[PDB]
Design an enzyme around this catalytic site. Structure first.
Site, PDB file in Angstrom:
ATOM      1  N   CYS A   1       0.827  -1.203   0.000  1.00 54.54           N
ATOM      2  CA  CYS A   1       0.000   0.000   0.000  1.00 54.54           C
ATOM      3  C   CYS A   1       0.867   1.260   0.000  1.00 54.54           C
ATOM      4  CB  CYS A   1      -0.930  -0.005   1.208  1.00 54.54           C
ATOM      5  SG  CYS A   1      -1.447  -1.661   1.692  1.00 54.54           S
ATOM      6  N   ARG A  32       3.302  -1.043  -4.973  1.00 56.71           N
ATOM      7  CA  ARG A  32       3.159  -1.485  -3.590  1.00 56.71           C
ATOM      8  C   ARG A  32       1.744  -1.949  -3.262  1.00 56.71           C
ATOM      9  NH1 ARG A  32       7.019   0.008  -0.072  1.00 56.71           N
ATOM     10  NH2 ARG A  32       6.079  -1.765   1.038  1.00 56.71           N
ATOM     11  N   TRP A  95      -3.414  -2.532  -1.087  1.00 53.90           N
ATOM     12  CA  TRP A  95      -3.217  -3.956  -1.353  1.00 53.90           C
ATOM     13  C   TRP A  95      -4.229  -4.702  -0.489  1.00 53.90           C
ATOM     14  CZ3 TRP A  95       2.038  -7.053  -0.566  1.00 53.90           C
ATOM     15  CH2 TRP A  95       1.818  -8.387  -0.926  1.00 53.90           C
ATOM     16  N   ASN A 122      -1.268   3.049   6.236  1.00 56.49           N
ATOM     17  CA  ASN A 122      -0.428   1.949   5.771  1.00 56.49           C
ATOM     18  C   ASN A 122      -0.012   1.132   6.987  1.00 56.49           C
ATOM     19  OD1 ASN A 122      -0.618   2.655   3.103  1.00 56.49           O
ATOM     20  ND2 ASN A 122       1.464   3.476   2.929  1.00 56.49           N
ATOM     21  N   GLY A 123      -0.476  -0.115   7.054  1.00 58.66           N
ATOM     22  CA  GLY A 123      -0.144  -0.990   8.161  1.00 58.66           C
ATOM     23  C   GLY A 123      -1.340  -1.750   8.697  1.00 58.66           C
ATOM     24  N   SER A 395      17.053  -8.922   2.166  1.00 55.41           N
ATOM     25  CA  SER A 395      15.781  -8.239   1.956  1.00 55.41           C
ATOM     26  C   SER A 395      16.028  -7.080   1.004  1.00 55.41           C
ATOM     27  CB  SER A 395      15.209  -7.760   3.282  1.00 55.41           C
ATOM     28  OG  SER A 395      14.185  -6.806   3.080  1.00 55.41           O
ATOM     29  N   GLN A 396      15.475  -7.175  -0.206  1.00 53.76           N
ATOM     30  CA  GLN A 396      15.588  -6.083  -1.166  1.00 53.76           C
ATOM     31  C   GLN A 396      14.982  -4.802  -0.606  1.00 53.76           C
ATOM     32  OE1 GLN A 396      14.750  -3.153  -3.803  1.00 53.76           O
ATOM     33  NE2 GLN A 396      12.990  -4.425  -3.239  1.00 53.76           N
ATOM     34  N   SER A 397      13.782  -4.899  -0.036  1.00 51.04           N
ATOM     35  CA  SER A 397      13.087  -3.722   0.467  1.00 51.04           C
ATOM     36  C   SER A 397      13.533  -3.335   1.868  1.00 51.04           C
ATOM     37  CB  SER A 397      11.578  -3.966   0.476  1.00 51.04           C
ATOM     38  OG  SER A 397      11.250  -5.028   1.356  1.00 51.04           O
ATOM     39  N   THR A 400      10.408  -6.297   4.831  1.00 49.76           N
ATOM     40  CA  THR A 400       9.610  -7.512   4.936  1.00 49.76           C
ATOM     41  C   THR A 400       9.339  -7.847   6.398  1.00 49.76           C
ATOM     42  OG1 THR A 400      10.684  -8.324   2.926  1.00 49.76           O
ATOM     43  CG2 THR A 400       9.446  -9.916   4.234  1.00 49.76           C
ATOM     44  N   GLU A 528      13.904 -20.678  -7.940  1.00 49.15           N
ATOM     45  CA  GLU A 528      13.610 -19.304  -8.337  1.00 49.15           C
ATOM     46  C   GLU A 528      12.906 -19.262  -9.689  1.00 49.15           C
ATOM     47  OE1 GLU A 528      13.337 -15.172  -8.630  1.00 49.15           O
ATOM     48  OE2 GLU A 528      13.314 -16.672  -7.028  1.00 49.15           O
ATOM     49  N   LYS A 532       9.189 -17.560 -10.301  1.00 54.74           N
ATOM     50  CA  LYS A 532       8.883 -16.524 -11.284  1.00 54.74           C
ATOM     51  C   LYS A 532       7.722 -16.939 -12.182  1.00 54.74           C
ATOM     52  CE  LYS A 532      11.576 -13.249 -10.251  1.00 54.74           C
ATOM     53  NZ  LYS A 532      11.233 -13.641  -8.857  1.00 54.74           N
ATOM     54  N   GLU A 535       4.557 -16.657 -10.512  1.00 49.25           N
ATOM     55  CA  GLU A 535       4.138 -15.340 -10.049  1.00 49.25           C
ATOM     56  C   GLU A 535       3.514 -14.514 -11.169  1.00 49.25           C
ATOM     57  OE1 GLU A 535       7.307 -13.085  -8.339  1.00 49.25           O
ATOM     58  OE2 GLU A 535       5.950 -11.785  -7.192  1.00 49.25           O
ATOM     59  N   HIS A 551      12.865 -40.733  -5.972  1.00 49.93           N
ATOM     60  CA  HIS A 551      12.167 -40.991  -4.721  1.00 49.93           C
ATOM     61  C   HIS A 551      10.688 -40.615  -4.775  1.00 49.93           C
ATOM     62  CE1 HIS A 551      16.057 -41.864  -2.998  1.00 49.93           C
ATOM     63  NE2 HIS A 551      16.497 -40.671  -3.351  1.00 49.93           N
ATOM     64  N   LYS A 650       4.218  -5.795  -4.249  1.00 53.03           N
ATOM     65  CA  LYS A 650       5.636  -5.897  -3.921  1.00 53.03           C
ATOM     66  C   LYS A 650       5.879  -5.549  -2.456  1.00 53.03           C
ATOM     67  CE  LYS A 650      10.235  -4.735  -5.653  1.00 53.03           C
ATOM     68  NZ  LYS A 650      10.466  -6.028  -6.362  1.00 53.03           N
TER      69      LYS A 650
HETATM   70  O1  LIG Z   1       9.625 -12.545  -7.150  1.00 53.29           O
HETATM   71  C1  LIG Z   1       9.204 -12.629  -6.035  1.00 53.29           C
HETATM   72  C2  LIG Z   1       9.425 -11.455  -5.062  1.00 53.29           C
HETATM   73  O2  LIG Z   1      10.670 -10.814  -5.350  1.00 53.29           O
HETATM   74  C3  LIG Z   1       9.342 -11.956  -3.604  1.00 53.29           C
HETATM   75  O3  LIG Z   1       9.568 -13.358  -3.531  1.00 53.29           O
HETATM   76  C4  LIG Z   1      10.313 -11.246  -2.663  1.00 53.29           C
HETATM   77  O4  LIG Z   1      11.626 -11.752  -2.868  1.00 53.29           O
HETATM   78  C5  LIG Z   1       9.946 -11.435  -1.191  1.00 53.29           C
HETATM   79  O5  LIG Z   1       8.680 -10.821  -0.945  1.00 53.29           O
HETATM   80  C6  LIG Z   1      11.005 -10.883  -0.262  1.00 53.29           C
HETATM   81  O6  LIG Z   1      11.131  -9.467  -0.503  1.00 53.29           O
HETATM   82  P1  LIG Z   1      12.472  -8.666  -0.102  1.00 53.29           P
HETATM   83  O7  LIG Z   1      13.680  -9.271  -0.720  1.00 53.29           O
HETATM   84  O8  LIG Z   1      12.234  -7.227  -0.546  1.00 53.29           O
HETATM   85  O9  LIG Z   1      12.508  -8.644   1.406  1.00 53.29           O
HETATM   86  O1  LIG Z   2       6.660 -42.493  -0.764  1.00 50.64           O
HETATM   87  C1  LIG Z   2       7.783 -42.094  -0.793  1.00 50.64           C
HETATM   88  C2  LIG Z   2       8.896 -43.136  -0.946  1.00 50.64           C
HETATM   89  O2  LIG Z   2       8.811 -44.068   0.133  1.00 50.64           O
HETATM   90  C3  LIG Z   2      10.284 -42.501  -1.056  1.00 50.64           C
HETATM   91  O3  LIG Z   2      10.226 -41.081  -1.056  1.00 50.64           O
HETATM   92  C4  LIG Z   2      11.250 -42.967   0.033  1.00 50.64           C
HETATM   93  O4  LIG Z   2      10.915 -42.349   1.271  1.00 50.64           O
HETATM   94  C5  LIG Z   2      12.704 -42.638  -0.300  1.00 50.64           C
HETATM   95  O5  LIG Z   2      13.064 -43.326  -1.498  1.00 50.64           O
HETATM   96  C6  LIG Z   2      13.643 -43.003   0.829  1.00 50.64           C
HETATM   97  O6  LIG Z   2      13.600 -44.429   1.040  1.00 50.64           O
HETATM   98  P1  LIG Z   2      14.141 -45.024   2.446  1.00 50.64           P
HETATM   99  O7  LIG Z   2      13.281 -44.518   3.558  1.00 50.64           O
HETATM  100  O8  LIG Z   2      14.114 -46.564   2.309  1.00 50.64           O
HETATM  101  O9  LIG Z   2      15.601 -44.552   2.557  1.00 50.64           O
END
Ligand SMILES: O=C[C@H](O)[C@@H](O)[C@H](O)[C@H](O)COP(=O)(O)O
Ligand SMILES: O=C[C@H](O)[C@@H](O)[C@H](O)[C@H](O)COP(=O)(O)O
Ligand SMILES: CC(=O)N[C@H]1[C@@H](OP(=O)(O)OP(=O)(O)OC[C@H]2O[C@@H](n3ccc(=O)[nH]c3=O)[C@H](O)[C@@H]2O)O[C@H](CO)[C@H](O)[C@@H]1O
Ligand SMILES: CC(=O)N[C@H]1[C@@H](OP(=O)(O)OP(=O)(O)OC[C@H]2O[C@@H](n3ccc(=O)[nH]c3=O)[C@H](O)[C@@H]2O)O[C@H](CO)[C@H](O)[C@@H]1O
Ligand SMILES: N[C@@H](CCC(=O)O)C(=O)O
Ligand SMILES: [Mg+2]
Ligand SMILES: [Mg+2]
Lengths: 655, 660
Positions: A1, A32, A95, A122-123, A395-397, A400, A528, A532, A535, A551, A650
């Site tokens: 906001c 914002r 926001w 704001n807040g 933290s970019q901003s 957060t 990442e 993106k 988002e 697994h 943001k």
């Molecule tokens: O693409 C996603 C945004 O960039 C978001 O994930 C951001 O990174 C977080 O909200 C943390 O923000 P700050 O880095 O500003 O603290």
């Molecule tokens: O449903 C999930 C599977 O069971 C699998 O993610 C398993 O957990 C891993 O392959 C580790 O196996 P172990 O527990 O035998 O090391």
């Protein structure tokens, strides 16, 4: 906001010039919060501007600022030609994280059906429920579901029960904030106090800009406690103030602001700014830094400018002639940091991915344990922290909420706190013992791009300092630094493939899901990249650690499921090839991001994005840029706005 | 993939009985998946079994063991009534790696057209190329595209070039393994050593079961290096040996087993078992607490369904003998001799893959709370990629149901090299991770036959909670918290039954998601792991794109996926994050999301404001994760059943078959 207001004292402005300034101010702050918007100005159509300050007009509408800009115009009651020698106008973009983004829930809020007091907030007020019941018993009716209305209905309660006939507007606001819990950045306007604005804060940004062709009476406003005290033009009265929650909405008009502090109750009376309970300073920002230039979107600009922002991050800190790294912000602490026993990186979202992207090299060059925590979970678990922990806050901003509360959590436990921020004067940069300003320049796009790569580079430079006294690591340091010297041009090489990425986006824009797979230094890349695409394109993209395929998650792969794999020429190459063979065996047809020289991969794979080779601990910067570009193009194909993704804005500064 | 050999020594068995025992052994190994199977036995129809010891017959076939059993009895020239006083039969189920499934590429692999030597193999011989070139130059023609055939041809090469006429079967096999590279479990048979068996392993499980109505000479077989020295019945000769790669094929006959280790060479000569080695150390004859019933579906239509619905029992089996509700004490027998050191260490590191890793995430918070130590939870594959720093005063935990997962095992050896105290949380006795850890806890959930981890997850959960309760049993300030948790465990089995009684409600949810391609599972705190584990189950079993999203991260990007069309499942329980979970729910709804909520029975507020809610009973906050994940186990199960999938079918296959 975002918050913005325009107070022109003895500077004649027509009602159109004022409204176009309030909208133009919200546009600077739209990133914002763009779920709704509103403005608050003086109504009435009397030639004498003095007989109009008693009538407040509120124009609020759902949508971005462009929906409000059209609601203001083409009205049949407001005459946009009245000249105002003195006028105050407040605006706000919201926001709407809760409830509906309706005009009733947008700001400014009002205290009654005659608009005697209007406030923009704001807040969050953590006790607005208790304040709502007290105000309802005294005879006040509530219309909206926001916590901001309890601030408008309360400033009027302090006005209906004052002791003297002329209690200053500050006294009314001072009695309000004493009943409010939580954080807030308020800007009041009332018919009873024509032209008088009041701006108090507490845990939420709020500065005051000033412009005047005349000389100012001071540059250090003395805070007071309940001619040679207020900031104002000396000989004449021509002055223009600019209340705002960010400096971007004020740089266009002036570069002279007064950053307030917690519980500082600023007030403009008779065109004189006085603080109750400062330093008139210049902003180190150019307007070109918050302009799209020749790009159709801020995000596109901020991606293609990463060659420059990487250079600015290293400016005055990396010397390639003698291979030295000096981070000025860590000079008085680097010694004590080295006597600590563990590193903890705390952040949210993309900033948290930056820690994942650099965890391995930090472990290598410092030889300390490195733990990377998501702030929200770090707080839920009450993570153990100790006096000899070094806690980094990315933290970019710098605002957060979760990252900031993690900071105070760690400080209470005696840890040394280090900030990796992109906003000078932010809460996180102030309250940390030390840190580095990544110097990437303002980031406007909601989705972080250059902040990630600048945080990446910054954490690498730190690592380089931590090992600059180890003989055995001297060559490794040179290798990395030579990589940094070549990184800006290699980034340019990746950007030149923009067209090839766009072609591939046309082969995926219609899909519903995409799995992005990588390991080692490129785990963070696939997390990442998945974030993106989520988002801004709204495709269901998910990052999967390549080593985890066998697994369970590999069951999801078939000839129909889109897959992107990252296979770089580092120590996990063979393991990445095995993962690729598994995906193929399941009939997958993946897009592989690989090195140009990786001929084996390029021959056996139809779709390949060939990026240049760099140092293993820097390749993550080059492998993520294609995914920034992919997400951008996918969003354009699907008809979405890359700078204004739905459902959010943001910087998460509240719950 | 599966190995089973049955040696009856002076226990008369007809050919029919021998073949039925081999077939029955492979039936216990089918759940591991396979594409072909074969058996090797003594051919010939001479009424005297002693003359039929120079004719080895093989029956190999592509397909299921059932087809093999039909092929066995479908032999016109074979007499199933001959009685054998001494006999060795071997059997194998193959998971093709080198060479396509076929009769020729099935096991046992023979050394020549007269079957002088045969061998069954689990694993891959890496250097099989060089070995095949050598034997061909020496005049040995191959007939299959399997790496295994090089083993059969090589053992005959060693025999053809023996120095004396009476070199031992062990000596020949010793010379073979010294030439092999990779991972292998092997059982050998030969006409030149009638009635004798040789088994050896390197990087692949192999065990020996033993049964005899007579006293055995010892319960600890000493190692012999290159009477009193071997295992045998004392007063008489009668004895039965069972070689196997999985105890499931032995437990119905005997529960006395020997677990072979890398490069051991076990041999049965004149009905006596010795273990040779080229390098008083010995191998123990131990008693398995496993029962045949524990590996049978019973009345359930699938192993997945059984292992989900029996979780009230497996949780009880995990706690049995280890929790005392009479005085609120916890005693993990496996940690008695190491709990003192563990309490002097300074950091806990949990290392695991997949669902076993989720068990660490699910118990991280309570471990932090009750130990007050830093707790780090690491995915084994990434732990290795990064060369994670590990120190002498770290306690590294290795969570593994099977105890053989490669990355988890390599992480274990990584940490041992650096002097860390290593602790296993495992469900397989004699497995690599159980043996090689300094100490640990067998979670005693019973064998897990289903493809996906169900009861193993919840038993690992309970086991780690029990460990947390040991670590703080000396803290006055935590006695109340320990009591609350232990009364929660006391009630947990009945609470699980309550959740299972909502199966109908879960089926309703399955039909609602029947046609869906994605679902977001959102939660935080104690239920972060519930989201990750529920998302992995639905991916693995149902093949739809389920993803776990930490609720506190929604406003940082992922919330953009929410609209009126995206299915969402949210977990809102009655713990300290309740308000933050409500905030997340308001965020979703504000964007037209209409989520299904897993919540406490008595959370009246959310039940009225949410259309569909799965209402589980309330337990201790650090135990609710067990109750909130079970509806997601069942959801995955019902969705797959609706879509025609076979929940007990792996599907997840490794790299393709190298044809060469
Ligand atoms: O693409 C996603 C945004 O960039 C978001 O994930 C951001 O990174 C977080 O909200 C943390 O923000 P700050 O880095 O500003 O603290
Ligand atoms: O449903 C999930 C599977 O069971 C699998 O993610 C398993 O957990 C891993 O392959 C580790 O196996 P172990 O527990 O035998 O090391
Ligand atoms: C803000 C400022 O005046 N920067 C100047 C400083 O940059 P530097 O690169 O030397 O420092 P910086 O901008 O990284 O940090 C400025 C100060 O803020 C502190 N800090 C920074 C980030 C954070 O999150 N937390 C925190 O506490 C840091 O410890 C230092 O005391 O010197 C340069 C010359 O070499 C230029 O003169 C820069 O303009
Ligand atoms: C395997 C076994 O026969 N256990 C017996 C043992 O259980 P406790 O319940 O007494 O043993 P449990 O199997 O944890 O541990 C058995 C042994 O294996 C060790 N271990 C276990 C798991 C692991 O991953 N790593 C590891 O080192 C552990 O340190 C201990 O030495 O005593 C019981 C009676 O009180 C029963 O007789 C159990 O059958
Ligand atoms: N490598 C052998 C055995 C594989 C196995 O079943 O474990 C083959 O492909 O025949
Ligand atoms: Mg500071
Ligand atoms: Mg052990």
């Amino acid at each position: 906001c975002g918050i913005f207001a325009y107070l022109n004292y003895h500077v004649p402005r027509t009602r159109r010039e004022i409204l176009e300034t309030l909208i133009k101010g919200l546009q600077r702050l739209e990133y914002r919060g763009y779920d709704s918007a509103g403005v608050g100005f003086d109504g009435g159509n009397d030639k004498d501007w003095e007989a109009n300050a008693c009538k407040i007009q509120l124009i609020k509408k759902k949508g971005k600022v462009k929906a409000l800009d059209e609601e203001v115009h083409k009205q049949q009651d407001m005459d946009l030609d009245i000249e105002f020698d003195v006028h105050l106008g407040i605006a706000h973009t919201r926001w709407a994280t809760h409830g509906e983004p309706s005009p009733v829930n947008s700001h400014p809020q009002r205290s009654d059906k005659n608009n005697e007091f209007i406030v923009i907030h704001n807040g969050i007020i953590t006790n607005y429920k208790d304040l709502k019941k007290f105000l309802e018993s005294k005879g006040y009716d509530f219309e909206s579901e926001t916590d901001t209305e309890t601030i408008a209905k309360l400033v009027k309660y302090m006005y209906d029960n004052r002791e003297s006939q002329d209690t200053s507007f500050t006294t009314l606001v001072e009695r309000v904030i004493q009943q409010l819990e939580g954080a807030f950045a308020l800007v009041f306007k009332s018919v009873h106090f024509p032209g008088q604005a009041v701006g108090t804060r507490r845990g939420s940004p709020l500065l005051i800009g000033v412009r005047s062709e005349h000389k100012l009476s001071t540059d250090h406003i003395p805070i007071l406690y309940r001619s040679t005290t207020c900031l104002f033009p000396v000989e004449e009265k021509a002055v223009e103030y600019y209340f705002a929650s960010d400096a971007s909405a004020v740089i266009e008009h002036t570069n002279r602001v007064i950053f307030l502090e917690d519980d500082d109750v600023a007030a403009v009376v008779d065109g004189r700014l006085s603080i109750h309970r400062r330093a008139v300073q210049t902003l180190q920002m150019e307007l070109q830094q918050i302009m799209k230039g020749n790009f159709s979107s801020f995000m596109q600009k901020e991606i293609f400018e990463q060659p420059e922002s990487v250079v600015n991050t290293m400016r005055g800190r990396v010397n390639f002639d003698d291979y030295t790294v000096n981070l000025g912000g860590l000079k008085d602490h680097i010694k004590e940091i080295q006597r600590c026993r563990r590193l903890i990186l705390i952040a949210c979202g993309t900033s948290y991915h930056a820690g994942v992207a650099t965890r391995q090299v930090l472990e290598e060059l410092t030889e300390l344990p490195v733990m990377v925590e998501l702030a929200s979970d770090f707080l839920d678990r009450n993570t153990p922290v100790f006096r000899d922990d070094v806690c980094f806050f990315l933290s970019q901003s710098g605002e957060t909420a979760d990252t900031l509360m993690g900071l105070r959590y760690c400080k209470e436990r005696g840890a040394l706190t280090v900030g990796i921020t992109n906003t000078v004067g932010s809460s996180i940069s102030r309250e940390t013992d030390c840190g580095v300003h990544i110097n990437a320049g303002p980031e406007i796009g909601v989705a972080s791009t250059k902040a990630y790569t600048s945080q990446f580079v910054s954490l690498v430079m730190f690592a380089l300092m931590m090992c600059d006294d180890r003989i055995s690591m001297q060559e490794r340091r040179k290798e990395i630094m030579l990589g940094l010297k070549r990184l800006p041009d290699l980034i340019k090489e990746v950007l030149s493939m923009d067209d090839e990425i766009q072609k591939l986006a046309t082969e995926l824009y219609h899909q519903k899901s995409v799995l992005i797979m990588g390991r080692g230094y490129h785990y963070a890349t696939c997390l990442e990249g998945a974030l993106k695409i989520k988002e801004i394109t709204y495709m269901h993209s998910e990052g999967i650690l390549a080593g985890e395929l066998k697994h369970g998650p590999l069951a999801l792969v078939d000839k129909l499921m889109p897959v992107i794999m990252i296979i770089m020429r580092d120590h996990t190459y063979a393991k990445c090839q095995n993962a690729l063979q598994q995906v193929v065996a399941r009939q997958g047809r993946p897009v592989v991001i690989c090195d140009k020289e990786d001929t084996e991969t390029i021959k056996n794979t139809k779709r390949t994005i060939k990026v240049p080779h760099s140092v293993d601990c820097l390749q993550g910067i080059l492998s993520v840029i294609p995914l920034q570009l992919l997400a951008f193009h996918l969003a354009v194909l699907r008809g979405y706005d890359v700078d204004f993704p739905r459902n959010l804005a943001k910087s998460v500064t509240v719950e």
